[PDB]
């Protein structure tokens, strides 16, 4: 135990290798420290322009994922032909060649029978090399059913940005220059999409920004904010609309962006209409129409009656935002908008970003910077045979585009995925049966609301293969398991991130020798499957790969699996390192320099870039969304109904012009409030790497970094008022029941919970995944599975699943 002499000391002499973390869609650039062939540490990549060395705490849990003792080391096949929660699959090990043979035989049988559309590809997480496995392979087989997870993620959060300013996507928030931050449910030092960077900056920003957090629970961000507004779930838009109302009455919209009355005098008087011709809008459209049709009556008193918020607080917030403009940013979280009528909460909250001029402004918010990363491999039309051309025209299994499922992504009827509804199409064989399914990086039985519907659906699929590191809940229903090399340590990939005024592109690369007999989901596996299909007489995918996915420097196809894995990344990133990317950001001299740095950074965002040229119908920032009217009109015309009939069929309250402006939709609620007196407030753990750290012991050891939670436990948090009402004490074993299901967990009394609600982290309740994540693997869960409580409901205008606002529950001691 003597200290080692200097020549034999080991501190600091190991190797740092660049990769990318995917614990959340922050997608931080990382370096991995390697010594004795083992990954020992993770840090933020110092070359990153978004976040630098800053990181959230979950980077360290990555090390218990790659070295998870319940990872699969071999392909497997089930030997119990029955599937179900009660059916042990009795998996036995097989070779890759045998596993892909079974899958290939089933795919080819579909084509021979002229039913290629009965194939489905399911995608959970992914990297930007996904186009081959997700889209090209699927369409070449002849199926339209490439089903992402986007609608169980955040599609409703894109409705406001798209239908108001043309951005079907996320924003970055300029916190370093903000003077007012208003968060509707966002908790950016714990979740959302740059936890590393917003954690870096949040505390410092409190010295120049006033911060208000609107959330039914006291989140970490609210605990470090100037005001916590404990909103009743589903009432966010009431506050957003009343703030806008006060802004107009007080005359404190941002005139350089919005415009002004022609004669100077502010004519917005509460309750009274204004002449449209009296106002000259600059970069916006529809302000007076919005006022005349609804906003003139969304007074602070109206809002206080619904929410209990002091009207003086509403007025003070509106005035503070007016004085801070344009250095004003409004965040929306999933909690505010992933509700059955949530499209109009996204619109109502995001409208404030236009009203106070924050959109594309200093201290405001704006989209990701332009980069030259390619996102698709070459077109495959020339490789489509007649079977495939017919199949890809079939209705999608998720029923997108039907009257009651407009899913208006990017303005198109049926434009968006409806992930959770694919289970309903499958189990009802409507539009048709799914007979062959390939799925990767996903666990929809656990992550989708009312996931037992996925139990039911998958039990009815003739053949399914799951590409996964662990035997998760979804894997339980697979015929074949195809073990994936771990995305962060054993894979070639590429991702991007936005924040700090920049967009970055980062590499994923293997940092260790491959541990087990696994293959990379998005490159090696489709390559091997294409070879197997070609051996069996269907060579279109193989020809597509070998003729179109060739090296950007040599023009040669990959010689083998390992080369192909790297080639997939080289191909899409060639504009960064083979060509001169100086016009967009960094100049990289070679592929090797890109790999060594591990990240490419854009130049800083040009403020006001989009002013006067939004990708909306008017090219303006639309308070009256002609963009959404055009999309709804298209959907209505498709189904030979009026727009009002669309609204009625999709269970929105809006009629007439209200369908196109920010307005109040009463939140949808399910269940009798007398039997189910509490509203569920679902939240993420700040130690969740999505649904993937429940088999990491360090997760449990530090679980109380979630404010109010308890180490090594799964707790539901009740206000002490409700604890007294229901006879609950800390540590009591409890059952929580909704109209659709139940879970068991433990009780915690916490004053940071709005009375009448119960705040509980999603992430526990696994009955599979591994030995730490479950009580008895395959049988008994650890903790309680939130989504068993959440009825299968949709924001039908976006396709999004609802996880918030509508869930009523009751509680009792077990």
């Amino acid at each position: 135990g003597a200290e080692l002499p200097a020549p034999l000391r080991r501190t600091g002499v190991g190797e740092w290798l660049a990769t990318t973390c995917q614990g959340c869609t922050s997608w931080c650039a990382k370096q991995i420290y390697v010594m004795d062939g083992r990954a020992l540490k993770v840090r933020g990549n110092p070359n990153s322009g978004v976040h630098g060395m800053s990181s959230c705490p979950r980077q360290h849990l990555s090390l218990q994922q790659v070295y998870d003792p319940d990872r699969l080391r071999t392909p497997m096949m089930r030997t119990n032909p029955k599937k179900g929660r009660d059916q042990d699959p009795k998996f036995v090990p097989i070779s890759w060649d045998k596993a892909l043979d079974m899958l290939a035989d089933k795919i080819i049988a579909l084509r021979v029978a002229n039913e290629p559309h009965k194939y489905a590809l399911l995608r959970g997480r992914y990297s930007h090399i996904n186009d081959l496995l997700y889209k090209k392979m699927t369409n070449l087989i002849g199926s339209p059913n490439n089903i992402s997870h986007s609608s169980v993620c955040a599609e409703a959060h894109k409705m406001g940005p798209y239908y108001l300013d043309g951005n079907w996507g996320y924003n970055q928030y300029d916190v370093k220059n903000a003077k007012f931050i208003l968060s509707f449910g966002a908790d950016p030092i714990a979740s959302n999409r740059q936890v590393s960077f917003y954690s870096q900056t949040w505390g410092d920003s409190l010295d120049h920004a006033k911060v208000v957090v609107v959330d039914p629970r006291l989140s970490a961000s609210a605990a470090k904010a100037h005001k916590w507004i404990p909103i009743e779930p589903g009432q966010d838009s009431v506050l957003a609309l009343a703030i806008a109302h006060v802004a107009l009455v007080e005359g404190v919209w941002h005139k350089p962006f919005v415009g002004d009355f022609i004669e100077g005098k502010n004519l917005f008087k509460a309750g009274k209409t204004v002449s449209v011709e009296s106002f000259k809008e600059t970069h916006t459209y529809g302000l007076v129409e919005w006022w005349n049709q609804a906003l003139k009556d969304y007074t602070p008193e109206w809002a206080s009656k619904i929410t209990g918020i002091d009207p003086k607080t509403i007025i003070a917030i509106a005035k503070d935002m007016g004085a801070a403009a344009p250095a004003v940013q409004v965040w929306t979280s999933r909690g505010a908008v992933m509700q059955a009528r949530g499209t109009y909460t996204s619109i109502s909250c995001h409208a404030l970003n236009g009203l106070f001029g924050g959109i594309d402004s200093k201290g405001g918010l704006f989209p990701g910077n332009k980069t030259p990363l390619l996102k698709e491999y070459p077109e495959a039309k020339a490789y489509m045979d007649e079977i495939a051309a017919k199949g890809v025209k079939k209705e999608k299994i998720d029923q997108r585009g039907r009257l009651e499922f407009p899913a208006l992504a990017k303005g198109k009827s049926g434009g968006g995925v409806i992930t959770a509804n694919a289970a309903n199409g499958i189990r009802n064989q409507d539009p048709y049966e799914i007979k062959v399914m390939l799925a990767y990086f996903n666990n929809f039985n656990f992550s989708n609301p009312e996931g037992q519907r996925w139990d039911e659906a998958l039990s009815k699929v003739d053949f399914m293969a799951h590409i996964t590191t662990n035997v998760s809940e979804f894997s339980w229903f697979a015929d074949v398991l195809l073990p994936s090399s771990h995305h962060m340590f054993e894979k070639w990939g590429v991702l991007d991130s936005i924040g700090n005024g920049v967009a970055q592109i980062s590499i994923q690369q293997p940092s260790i020798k491959r541990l087990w007999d696994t293959r990379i989901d998005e490159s090696e596996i489709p390559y091997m499957l294409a070879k197997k299909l070609a051996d069996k007489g269907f060579d279109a995918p193989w020809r597509y790969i070998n003729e179109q996915i060739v090296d950007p420097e040599t023009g040669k196809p990959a010689a083998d699996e390992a080369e192909f894995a790297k080639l997939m990344v080289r191909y899409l990133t060639a504009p960064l390192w083979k060509e001169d990317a100086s016009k967009y950001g960094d100049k990289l001299s070679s592929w090797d320099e890109f790999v060594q740095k591990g990240v490419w950074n854009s130049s800083p965002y040009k403020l006001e870039a989009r002013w006067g040229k939004f990708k909306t119908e008017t090219t303006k920032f639309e308070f009256y969304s002609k963009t959404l009217e055009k999309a709804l009109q298209s959907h209505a015309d498709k189904h030979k109904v009026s727009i009002d009939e669309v609204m009625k069929a999709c269970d929105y309250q809006a009629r007439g012009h209200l369908a196109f402006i920010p307005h109040y939709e009463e939140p949808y609620r399910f269940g009798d409030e007398s039997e189910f007196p509490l509203l569920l407030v679902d939240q993420k753990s700040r130690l969740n790497k999505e649904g993937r750290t429940a088999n990491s012991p360090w997760y449990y050891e530090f679980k109380d970094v979630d404010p109010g939670d308890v180490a090594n436990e799964d707790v539901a948090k009740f206000n002490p008022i409700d604890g007294k009402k229901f006879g609950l004490k800390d540590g009591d074993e409890i059952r929580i029941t909704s109209p659709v299901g139940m879970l068991t967990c433990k009780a915690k009394l916490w004053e940071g919970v709005r009375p009448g609600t119960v705040a509980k982290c999603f992430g526990q309740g696994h009955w599979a995944y591994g030995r730490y994540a479950s009580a008895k693997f395959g049988v008994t869960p650890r903790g309680g599975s939130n989504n068993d409580l959440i009825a299968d409901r949709y924001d039908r205008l976006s396709g999004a699943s609802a996880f918030y606002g509508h869930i009523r529950v009751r509680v009792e001691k077990v």
Binding site: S55, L218, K227, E751, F777
Partner: protein, 234 residues
Amino acid sequence: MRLGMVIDLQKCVGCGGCSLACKTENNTNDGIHWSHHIATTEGTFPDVKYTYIPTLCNHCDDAPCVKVCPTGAMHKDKRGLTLQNNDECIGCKKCMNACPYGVISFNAATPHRRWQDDSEVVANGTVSPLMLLKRTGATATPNENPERGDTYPMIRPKRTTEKCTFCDHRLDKGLNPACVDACPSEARVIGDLDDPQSKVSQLIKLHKPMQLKPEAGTGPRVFYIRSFGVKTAY
């Protein structure tokens, strides 16, 4: 020389990244965390305050753990750190009762015993803790950091105590403590409190410093500045 740390509570977001970094750096057994925290919730709804205070060894000026140690295993070094010759620890636990802060842990459990399990959740399909140990070449856990062994056992023996060493092995190489490097907001700063020009010396002049349990008379050298929360507006 009196090395110490200043922690800025306004910058701190209460994420535990420092404590997880310590786990990866120092190979502490499951349940043993040299870096930890004290969190408090105060007030009745809706006027609720939550605060998180990161904690570690305070490397005290007048360390009672050193004074009571019967073997001399616990000792001060020339940097002012409280370090331990683990080889001379007899597991008497006197240090733990003397320390006012509860930052010392006792290895009653065999460290990393959960990695000796060779059961598989799916037989001949998934792996096992023991198999992962064999595959990676590690001795006790695939997550063990060999650097730790420069100055302290990489894996401590049962029936010894252990605590934060201020990442002495990293300081010896001119590097930063793992928890300092791990902090996203740079809330943690270390330096020589005897140097008036050090960043730590200047921080506690620019801001009013606070210490945990100064009344215990140990002269702790972790100082807290500013506030985790802010006063409510409106």
